[PDB]
Design a binder for this molecule. Structure first.
Ligand SMILES: N#Cc1nn(-c2c(Cl)cc(C(F)(F)F)cc2Cl)c(N)c1[S@@](=O)C(F)(F)F
Length: 271
């Protein structure tokens, strides 16, 4: 029960997701793996908040399985950074392809495109990982890869992990996940955006379509206020993004790891 423009909107967003999101992670390869003075206390706190074991199912049926070390006050806490930087770079490329395919994004001036991508790449990445997150086992299932949280109520103290469990509980459709990505991408208040009036009108239209979609396709009392919960999710995710951008820059300051694409998105110039 949407306007013709509203369903053309969902159709195009659902199309750009289909073309740019490798849900089986088939083309993620050549990645790195762990081998076979008051900043550090913060960096140690930054790192220990999301430790994860890693499983690789080979095409032949073999299984590699990695258990990370415990914190012993040394550089061994940096063991997973190259791999997770390689995974982030792969996700970021899918995000950039996603935005480039959308006509509303394409139509913005280029300098506004980079500004919007710098501001929302993390958030769109987190949103895509939620669709492959298994809340019953605490595992991100990325095709032949899987990432299982180490052994509960004290794990939800981490805001990002708390975000993933709450978003998964909302039981969202594919159409609702992609409208969330559009709203986060077309945020008029990212640093450096110039066409903020255009970008705000675009954002307001993606939110209105989402509100109408829920009310057309979700009449159950369980989904009362669902639109407002999602919009609050997005504000929460957005705060998680800011506070994590500093986590990453702190680690980068004392132990470099960011790929060239990660530097581009986060403002590191090379000197
Ligand atoms: N952005 C994005 C982003 N995705 N991820 C992420 C990765 Cl790489 C892997 C998993 C896995 F399932 F594999 F465990 C889960 C997640 Cl949520 C992380 N750590 C980030 S950020 O910290 C960064 F580094 F800035 F990209």
């Amino acid at each position: 029960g949407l306007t013709e423009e509203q369903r053309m909107m969902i159709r195009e967003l659902m199309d750009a997701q289909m073309k740019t999101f490798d849900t089986t992670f088939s083309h993620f390869k050549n990645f790195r793996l762990p081998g076979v003075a008051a900043k550090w206390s913060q960096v140690r706190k930054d790192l220990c908040s999301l430790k994860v074991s890693l499983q690789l199912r080979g095409e032949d049926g073999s299984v590699w399985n990695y258990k990370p070390p415990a914190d012993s006050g040394g550089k061994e806490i940096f063991s997973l950074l190259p791999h997770m930087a390689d995974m982030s770079t792969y996700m970021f490329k899918g995000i950039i392809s996603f935005a480039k395919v959308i006509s509303y994004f394409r139509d913005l001036p280029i300098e506004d495109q980079i500004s919007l991508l710098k501001g929302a790449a993390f958030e769109l990445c987190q949103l895509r990982f939620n669709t492959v997150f298994n809340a019953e086992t605490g595992t991100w299932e990325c095709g032949r890869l899987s990432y299982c949280l180490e052994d509960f109520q004290q794990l939800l103290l981490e805001p990002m992990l708390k975000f993933h469990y709450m978003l998964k509980k909302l039981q969202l459709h594919e159409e609702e996940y992609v409208l969330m990505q559009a709203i986060s991408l077309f945020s008029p208040d990212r640093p450096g955006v110039l066409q903020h009036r255009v970008v705000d009108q675009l954002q307001e239209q993606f939110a209105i379509t989402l509100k109408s979609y829920i009310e057309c396709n979700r009449p159950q009392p369980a989904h009362r206020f669902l639109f407002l919960k999602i919009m609050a999710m997005l504000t929460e995710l957005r705060s998680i993004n800011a506070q994590h951008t500093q986590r990453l820059l702190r680690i980068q300051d004392i132990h470099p790891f960011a790929t060239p694409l990660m530097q581009e998105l986060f403002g590191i110039t090379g000197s």
